[PDB]
Amino acid sequence: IAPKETEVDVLIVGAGPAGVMCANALAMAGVNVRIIDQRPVKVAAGQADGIQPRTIEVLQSYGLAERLLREANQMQMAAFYNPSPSGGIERTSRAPDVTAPNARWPFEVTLHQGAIEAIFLDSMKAHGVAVERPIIPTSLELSDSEDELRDPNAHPVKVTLKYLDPPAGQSDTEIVSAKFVLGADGAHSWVRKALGITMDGEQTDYIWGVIDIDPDSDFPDVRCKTAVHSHNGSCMIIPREGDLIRLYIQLADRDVLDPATGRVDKSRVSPEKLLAVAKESFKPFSMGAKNGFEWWTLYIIGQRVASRFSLHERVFIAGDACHTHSPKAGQGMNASMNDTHNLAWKLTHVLRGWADISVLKTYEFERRKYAQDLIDFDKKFSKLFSGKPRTEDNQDGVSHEEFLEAFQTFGLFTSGIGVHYQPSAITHAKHQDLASTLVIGERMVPHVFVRAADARPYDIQDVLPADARFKILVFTGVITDPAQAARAAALAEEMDAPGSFYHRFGHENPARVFDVLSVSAAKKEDVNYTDLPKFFRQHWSKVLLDDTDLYARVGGGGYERYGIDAGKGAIVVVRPDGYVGTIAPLHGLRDIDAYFSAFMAA
Amino acid sequence: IAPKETEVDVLIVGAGPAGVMCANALAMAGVNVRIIDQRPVKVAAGQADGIQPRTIEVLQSYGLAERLLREANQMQMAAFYNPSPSGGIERTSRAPDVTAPNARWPFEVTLHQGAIEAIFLDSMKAHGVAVERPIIPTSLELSDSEDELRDPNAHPVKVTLKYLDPPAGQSDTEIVSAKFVLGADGAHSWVRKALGITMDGEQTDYIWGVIDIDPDSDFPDVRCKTAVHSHNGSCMIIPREGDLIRLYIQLADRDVLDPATGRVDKSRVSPEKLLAVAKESFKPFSMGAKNGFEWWTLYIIGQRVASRFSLHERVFIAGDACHTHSPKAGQGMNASMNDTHNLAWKLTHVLRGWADISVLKTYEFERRKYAQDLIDFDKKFSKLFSGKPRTEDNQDGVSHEEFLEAFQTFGLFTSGIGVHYQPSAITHAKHQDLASTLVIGERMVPHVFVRAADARPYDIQDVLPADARFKILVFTGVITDPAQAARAAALAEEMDAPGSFYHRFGHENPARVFDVLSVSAAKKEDVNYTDLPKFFRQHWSKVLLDDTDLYARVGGGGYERYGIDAGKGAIVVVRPDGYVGTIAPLHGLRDIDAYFSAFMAA
């Protein structure tokens, strides 16, 4: 039965978090994408379960946060229990789970991986895309021809797929010719191995017992992230959806090795035993399960980074396939999902012919560095963050000053807000002076503005969706001053003139590429939406004001917050993934032109 | 051939706003409900456009506001245009659409009737209830037998239905025997007529042209609720979903009368003509349609109230079937929807055997009075609110002080928040002193509290859903003070004692009837959820604190806001529809017992 031969723009191998983020993003952008998985059915329970503040913001950009917040538990508060004068544990302190006053949502949310995936899968289905399964790649061939590798319309990747459960009569093999392929196939990536890419770092894997239960407990902080150190041992509570909690229990090599044949034997440790360890650690508080185990595993996990995150910018890897993090690093699946949020808009642009293929180099540049920074920080500084109290002079060989700086950095890693991309084609660190708070290469900073047309308030993030468009935020200054109004009008002419970047890169319909917004430093009492130049109000909703809502509950103070001189203004470019790409003065359109020129095709 | 004969607990005639609110509420409470409509398919458009603040709160109580707010346009801002000294219209003032600083959502939202209904219909379908259509009543019989009329398990209403388009094979006639029937069949209610109930009030009907368009206009306030008086006549903009607006245009008797034979000829008014009138009224601004009419009608509307809103508390009427309001009164379908939000929990309780049938008398008492109050206010004071500016000394024969008081009252009518039910079996106006802000008979006042267990903040309204339960809010005072802690414990034993109201009226599972919550006047630093008596923490989430969220963004100041002495505390009872039913001191449980005793069956 001859093998079937097909093409596709993007093939994704693996339908975990990274996979579904990517598939959804591509589907919502109307890209021709397929996604496969070797598992006959979707994961139902457990695994990754924490979502970070920045990741919530990202899901918001896709319209998916609403559902997450409706279904998920809020991990708002963390608590620390430690050995007591009397024996077993007492509470020493509590703190916000998240230390990040920028954050729109300054907490984590928890929910089982099955349910997180569902948010993406349901969105995918609505946009015409379904996981095909069970299927595995058996072979991956890639073109020698440099001309083919650099041609974004060639299909140089040939992936041979085997159907593990084909309809009777039909072939078990499909040979897919793809323009781009992504390996989102987890820590044991078949794709990574096939590409001949190493995983560099410590060879030590660590072992964690994990049980999800419905707790029978008088423990007061059962709904907090709780670090428990007892005479008997450590564990940690992650509160989950409803009344459920997860208990992580650190285990030893000893607990899992075979006294005879010295092999890793996971059957030595049962959930019953894990729970018995917890019971002891929680004394004098009770801890049992109301109804056995919702889920359990022995999680074996090391920290490593792939030596490369793409081959020829035609096959990529993402998530655990190219970097893994310990549970104590607090990353779960968050960096994995932000990898493909970074990748997809870039793939999208290349396929639409809007961006030169070289823009995809920025994926590895940005995301691989971040992964290394996480693990470099964990190695240097993780000893500080077990949740035993700092008692001593210069404890763990670091001063108070150095501890505070590390706790700050750590908080920025776990929130997901710290991500600071280095200069590249899509990150031009110039004119930072003009909006010192809107750090270039970091995500656009939440603040509320108000529409001139209808006085409705919006966080700026809500006007920066993941719609595969760049956003040009034109901070016009005090638009009521005739001089600054004339300035605004001049800039609008300039941007809409035929040779400008907007039209030259706009492919006959520039508003599909570039979303232009005004943000004027005046109040609604003095500005109607029609007062702005047409180019700054392409729709009536594009006219924002630095002003409060009608009941003075939100808004105002935006120019001050962002560090923008209200008398001069600035142009702030935000990428489709919501990161600030560059800044320029109102007279500095030529620098915006240079920005897009470094990666967009005419 | 032979007509089909069926039974049902509740039959609803009409699937408009009032109808679907009722059907959904009953479905969510697991009541056996059927609902019919004579329209072959669901409407795409209609009268309803505007949802008031209180109504949003109500949808929130069903979990339906989220979807409304996602789909609907926000009418945040109102504008007023009037004839200019020189000619043409000019803007005289702008203002918040809504005057209500309590309000959780201090604005109106707008959306087409089809889409509002959908929110309810999709919820209904998820709970196993579908509108049956097209069907009309042809006959309504009601029992003579007093014993049958007073028996909540008898079926004394016989409604004969005709199927306008029956499946082949089946009969075109069904005789439904119902326990309760509701007429939600509009201003020309067949049900009202059948019951022989008059509509009392002014005989004068007024005439309005209505057109929904996508405006081609340079009018600056096209996204505001705008009152426009021109030399040529008055009209009003209601902004709608997307770019759409609705224009209400006031007409004369002459515009629909025959210049010759003086007969009512409604064909003399076309949408084309209504738009031509708008064009003139907006001068010097432009106003045209981009693409014909989304919708239009001739709204003929008077203000009247049915002389009775039920017969024997077995057949009820609601919405336009028992009271109508002018467009300038600002009610749209909002009082209609709040009618059935009032009725359904009460029907529910009677059917579950939790309440005596006489409690249904409170429907007419509460909702008919509100309707009369609306129209009495409109007759006295509507001259003030055409949207013409106050230019003169003592204009319209009222002083500045009296004008301001009337504008305040009016704002409370249009917000929906002003509703103040008079004393009855379910409204005991006693101990008002102890929480002067929580007016008895008015809706529970929004304020944010924080859970002790996990520090998550919630508006109190979010802990008062429409789940057919009464809610007992026990404000415990300063729970950290030993004396007040002992007091709290004493009250908890009292409430959970075998002879108490809770058990005596709890029907073997009292938590299905009564939702008990704590609200302690202390901070999380000082109170874990386990510190409270068991009865005040039946679930860990029942323990609320008057404290801020972790970032001090919301919460605090609740006891002060409500007017409760933190040293003494109070019991506040909230009805299933979210209105405050009574208040009592912590030593006054006998008054709570008296409350429930006036209407609950043992």
Ligand SMILES: Cc1cc2nc3c(=O)[nH]c(=O)nc-3n(C[C@H](O)[C@H](O)[C@H](O)COP(=O)(O)OP(=O)(O)OC[C@H]3O[C@@H](n4cnc5c(N)ncnc54)[C@H](O)[C@@H]3O)c2cc1C
């Ligand atoms: C048993 C188990 C326990 C875990 N416990 C925890 C925990 O306690 N805490 C925690 O934070 N994380 C845990 N995880 C891991 C968690 O899922 C990851 O840390 C995170 O989700 C990485 O996301 P990813 O997007 O890289 O893809 P993954 O979540 O790994 O998704 C990979 C997917 O690819 C599929 N796949 C693999 N190989 C192929 C192939 N050749 N062809 C096609 N499809 C393929 C798999 O079926 C899987 O569905 C656990 C994982 C497993 C398997």
Ligand SMILES: Cc1cc2nc3c(=O)[nH]c(=O)nc-3n(C[C@H](O)[C@H](O)[C@H](O)COP(=O)(O)OP(=O)(O)OC[C@H]3O[C@@H](n4cnc5c(N)ncnc54)[C@H](O)[C@@H]3O)c2cc1C
């Ligand atoms: C054609 C039409 C146009 C309207 N246009 C406007 C407008 O432009 N602006 C405005 O402000 N208001 C308008 N209205 C009034 C509007 O219907 C209501 O004020 C509002 O939509 C909701 O109030 P309600 O829930 O009480 O009832 P309704 O919406 O009236 O719900 C009941 C509906 O069921 C149908 N029905 C009637 N008799 C029976 C029966 N015996 N059995 C079953 N179904 C029956 C009717 O079509 C009736 O409208 C219009 C009404 C109609 C019928």
